[PDB]
Amino acid sequence: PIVQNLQGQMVHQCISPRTLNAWVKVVEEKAFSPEVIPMFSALSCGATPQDLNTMLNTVGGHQAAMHMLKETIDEEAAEWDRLHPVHAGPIAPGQMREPRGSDIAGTTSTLQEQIGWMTHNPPIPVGEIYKRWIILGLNKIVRMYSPTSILDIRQGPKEPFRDYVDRFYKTLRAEQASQEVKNAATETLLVQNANPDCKTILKALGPGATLEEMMTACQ
Amino acid sequence: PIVQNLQGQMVHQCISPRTLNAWVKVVEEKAFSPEVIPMFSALSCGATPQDLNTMLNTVGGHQAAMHMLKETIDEEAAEWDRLHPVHAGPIAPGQMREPRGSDIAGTTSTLQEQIGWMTHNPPIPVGEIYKRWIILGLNKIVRMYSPTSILDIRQGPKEPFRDYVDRFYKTLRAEQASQEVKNAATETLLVQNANPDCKTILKALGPGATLEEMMTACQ
Amino acid sequence: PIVQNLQGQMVHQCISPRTLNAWVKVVEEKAFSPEVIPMFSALSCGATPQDLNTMLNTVGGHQAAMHMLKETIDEEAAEWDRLHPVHAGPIAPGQMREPRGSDIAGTTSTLQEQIGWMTHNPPIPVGEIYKRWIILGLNKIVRMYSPTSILDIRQGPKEPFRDYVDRFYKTLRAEQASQEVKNAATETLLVQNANPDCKTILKALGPGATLEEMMTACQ
Amino acid sequence: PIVQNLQGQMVHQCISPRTLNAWVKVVEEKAFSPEVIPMFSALSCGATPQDLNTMLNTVGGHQAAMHMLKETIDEEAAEWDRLHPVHAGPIAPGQMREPRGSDIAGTTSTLQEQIGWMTHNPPIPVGEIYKRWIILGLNKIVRMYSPTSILDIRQGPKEPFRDYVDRFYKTLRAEQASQEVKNAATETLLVQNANPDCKTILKALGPGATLEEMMTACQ
Amino acid sequence: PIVQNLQGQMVHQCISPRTLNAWVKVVEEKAFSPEVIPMFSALSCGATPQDLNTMLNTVGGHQAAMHMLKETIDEEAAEWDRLHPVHAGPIAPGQMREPRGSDIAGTTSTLQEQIGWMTHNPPIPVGEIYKRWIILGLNKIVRMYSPTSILDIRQGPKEPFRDYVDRFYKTLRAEQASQEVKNAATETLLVQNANPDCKTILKALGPGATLEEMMTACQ
Amino acid sequence: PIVQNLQGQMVHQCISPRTLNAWVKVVEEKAFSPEVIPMFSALSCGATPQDLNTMLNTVGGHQAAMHMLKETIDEEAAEWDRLHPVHAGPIAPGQMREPRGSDIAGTTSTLQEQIGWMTHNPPIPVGEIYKRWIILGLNKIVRMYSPTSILDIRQGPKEPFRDYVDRFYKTLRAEQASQEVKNAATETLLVQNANPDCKTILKALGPGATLEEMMTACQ
Ligand SMILES: [Cl-]
Ligand SMILES: [Cl-]
Ligand SMILES: [Cl-]
Ligand SMILES: [Cl-]
Ligand SMILES: [Cl-]
Ligand SMILES: [Cl-]
Ligand SMILES: [Cl-]
Ligand SMILES: [Cl-]
Ligand SMILES: [Cl-]
Ligand SMILES: [Cl-]
Ligand SMILES: [Cl-]
Ligand SMILES: [Cl-]
Ligand SMILES: [Cl-]
Ligand SMILES: [Cl-]
Ligand SMILES: [Cl-]
Ligand SMILES: [Cl-]
Ligand SMILES: [Cl-]
Ligand SMILES: [Cl-]
Ligand SMILES: [Cl-]
Ligand SMILES: [Cl-]
Ligand SMILES: [Cl-]
Ligand SMILES: [Cl-]
Ligand SMILES: [Cl-]
Ligand SMILES: [Cl-]
Ligand SMILES: [Cl-]
Ligand SMILES: [Cl-]
Ligand SMILES: [Cl-]
Ligand SMILES: [Cl-]
Ligand SMILES: [Cl-]
Ligand SMILES: [Cl-]
């Protein structure tokens, strides 16, 4: 990654074996669960496009998802080239060439060029731009591999309300619905999909009840 | 986190894989036991709002609690906006804009802005302010998930007084009662809920006896 | 902890996940064995009062001992206030306020104030003062939880003298007797509690024999 | 490796025990799977030719592949000598001698000479040149040890399309075919080798369908 | 330990949790085998007397040996006081007081005083002096706990000569005999204690044969 | 080891617990396999003679080999003294005394003297000179403990050619034959010791075939 050393200058460091192993293990253990994406974003803190390609390519298996990830990366790279056409001309002695879509993806750019963009003033954060493309493609993989729909998450007649809400927002997180549909899930599906005994209690609670108040009422 | 390097300047460092893994493991092993909160506060030492959101979002499962945590965060963010209304106007070339409630929660603020507030002179510690909101919501989760009331912790007729006091303050810690009710628990419930043999000995001890004196007397 | 960086200035560092995990594990594995106290003192090297409270509060269970530890801390804090009454008045622009007993315990003082005392010239080592209070309370827990008295440690008729001396000083260490009673344990109880065959040999050795000479004679 | 320290100067560091152990373990666990090559490239970040020879020589077993790796290294070293014949003459007091093919492979060059080339201005990156030779030979080992041909990867009549695509691109990755043959694998073999039910659905999808659209259609 | 930082000045660092755990584990696993002593010397590199007492006191059990270690430390401390009687008088503003025997053992000296002696110019290496006393006492424990004498290590009639020499020098190492008795062990006891078949071959080899030549001859 | 810090000056660092443990473990797991020697050379990067003696002495067991290692060290030390007789005379205030053979082995030299030679200008690399002696003795141990001769490595009638070549160069590596005998092993013994079916195919391949071509032909 490109990290600021203990002197105030942005320099390159090699990706650590701890970072490499941590990313491989979480994919082996959790696959494409929703919480893997924030783990990927944190383990790739300050990562160059080369570091991002390293983390992706060190993953063995799940190649169906890894190839869906490449298509999303190519789609975003093509959109970047449509919005940022590179202007031909010799690069000034102290400047950097404009990055193409494949340059941000680390496939047509060298590490020195990636360091040059990320450490420029003002900097071109090709690592963070590439990471946005990767996380976008990873989120589509999480939704595709989500097995259960939120409509099928219903509380059992003897299931504790706490365990049911655990399954509810676990499923809703993988579905990655819109903000409007997710915010009202507390007042709509969570009450509708509860068992008759708890739904009766939640009805007498009235609208605008917090999740803490709803879980307390059905305990 | 924002850490002072070995030169006296506050700079940003990426959250370490050791920190990321340590927080995920303690939640997998201890869930929301009371001692998880001081572990979260220590692992998030100097953490930015982005680091705090990272630690929370890397947690898979327990989504009922994680969503109760979001509501507490939104409640505190709304209270911050009520007490600190942002004043409109162009930001001076060397100053920072006033953070909104969602800016402290890391949802509407960039890392550069969070670094700008935390490294300002005087600094706006949005990371520590956000951590106060998170710990507040985490403490409410510990109380809700506390299974046993302190009134039901009674010493068995053959249970050693040491094991009974272990269960007593373990339950009392999760209940997180007031300081007045918790301080007098030594002289009130701890003696009342003891078995007849030890309660007789603790009665002859008289008021004002230390826990060391009470445990010694019933050994 | 407050550590001297690689430039000669005392600055604050966050407590490491390795330090946090090491202290939690040794309590889970060894509880309050005598050797846990030097491990606590080493793991808390240069620790601030906040770091000390962190290590104590991350311990789940053993709450009977942890509450006995709080009473010892409060007793020492009250003794500190009796010997150091804070003088009222505005603090000079470059000075620090006098710490109260609860300030050294980290309950009424901020981290910045603890850094201010520990890095002062001359420094007020509130971390080492607090650690003395904690170790004092921890030593009382080791004695209370010591199951066997030194008077009951006797060598078996067929027990090797080496194993008996292992049990002897293991028990004596947890008892934490006075220096006078512990120094003469070599010449008094260790010989008296040996089996008849080894006691006969140790009698012919004469007074002033080293433990190496006594163990060799009964081999 | 040759790493830039926290002062802006390229200096040598010893290869860490974490790096040494991580490379030995991944070979013990994954042998010559395709994802081992990006792991080798990352673990050898900034590595000198001596570090590269160290990582290769610490591998016990797989000596058939390790000897095939030596022949590829010798072939590339001979090609380097054909394109870069060293010019005889005394080296200037501040310059470096031209590296031979065996000098880049670390067999006829000292560490000081490798540091001299890598830290030169302009630098001769003998470590990255050697790594290109090693990765080239490692890729030939991956293809040779690939057990299954892509033509034999066909979807079962009841096999889910997701698992079939997992096996498809896993096999195709080890085959390491040309870019033209690999890019069209989505529109050609992946549909041809699917079961009759999914092939019918993929036919009605039409050409130019993304892998995300194809996997969704056969779910 | 007192380590030279990355600026050329000798400063104090806290003993690491890795060092603390490594010393406790090797004692739990190997007890007082001969190879534990060089491990103790390496783990205590640059250690202060406080660090040395920390490592010794973190050891639970083996208290018979740990108390024999204290007597050896007191014997050496008394010998130091006999050779270095402290001269009374006020210490100059830039000097250090002469260390007593108990000051080197870390029992009557503070860490600041130990840092003052070790970082003095010229330095008083109280840590290395104390370590010599500890290693001296540890070596006496290794000899006492050595179960087998070198005279009883004889090669079996069917035992391979390699395994017999393994047992020979393993026993001889724990005995820690004199240099004269240990150097000639190759030409004396190693041949005398071999089986009749190998002793016949070693006799025809003649004097002055290396261990490599002796092991080859009896293979 | 003597490592260049982050300021361009060669200073001493204590050998890390990770380095100490890594060397002990690889000897416990792999003994004296050929790949242990490059692991020893890497773990001892920049090691002083004291660090080298530390790594050797921390090895418990295998004392037959460890004593054969001492004789090789003494042989090389005697050869060093024969080629470098120390010249008597007082050492200049800024110079270092000439190292004897036992000084390079770390037995008659202090750490300060070893630092003085290694950090001299020009430096006397006593650590690398000692390491050459150790690796020389370690290689003789690998050959002695090699159980199988290369002449006895023959391909089974149903053994895959890949597994046979694995056993071939594994045995040849431990034998550590000459370069001339090892280079022609591809064209001589590897074909001669193959089964009749593969030997027939390798005969029709003709001379000068690469190992990749030979393994492909017998697959
Ligand atoms: Cl690492
Ligand atoms: Cl995987
Ligand atoms: Cl994310
Ligand atoms: Cl450019
Ligand atoms: Cl609940
Ligand atoms: Cl880490
Ligand atoms: Cl979890
Ligand atoms: Cl807390
Ligand atoms: Cl701003
Ligand atoms: Cl008790
Ligand atoms: Cl850590
Ligand atoms: Cl515990
Ligand atoms: Cl202590
Ligand atoms: Cl103040
Ligand atoms: Cl004994
Ligand atoms: Cl390491
Ligand atoms: Cl292997
Ligand atoms: Cl690669
Ligand atoms: Cl040169
Ligand atoms: Cl799917
Ligand atoms: Cl550590
Ligand atoms: Cl132990
Ligand atoms: Cl030693
Ligand atoms: Cl003094
Ligand atoms: Cl042998
Ligand atoms: Cl370490
Ligand atoms: Cl071993
Ligand atoms: Cl080597
Ligand atoms: Cl000298
Ligand atoms: Cl093959």
Author numbering:
A (entry chain C), B (entry chain C), C (entry chain C), D (entry chain C), E (entry chain C), F (entry chain C): 1 to 219
Question: Which text from the study accompanies this structure?
Answer:
Lenacapavir (LEN) is a long-acting, highly potent HIV-1 capsid (CA) inhibitor. The evolution of viral variants under the genetic pressure of LEN identified Q67H, N74D, and Q67H/N74D CA substitutions as the main resistance associated mutations (RAMs). Here, we determined high-resolution structures of CA hexamers containing these RAMs in the absence and presence of LEN. High-resolution co-crystal structures of LEN in a complex with cross-linked CA hexamers revealed that the inhibitor binds in a hydrophobic pocket formed by two adjacent CA subunits.
Both of the changes introduced by the Q67H and N74D substitutions in the inhibitor-binding pocket were also evident in the CA(Q67H/N74D) structures. The unliganded CA(Q67H/N74D) exhibits the closed conformation of the His67 side chain, which is maintained through its hydrogen bonding with the carbonyl oxygen of the main chain of Gln63 and its π–π stacking interaction with Tyr169. The CA(Q67H/N74D) and CA(Q67H/N74D) + LEN structures reveal combined effects seen with the two individual substitutions, in which a conformational switch with the Q67H change and the electrostatic repulsions due to the N74D substitution collectively make the inhibitor-binding pocket less amenable to LEN.
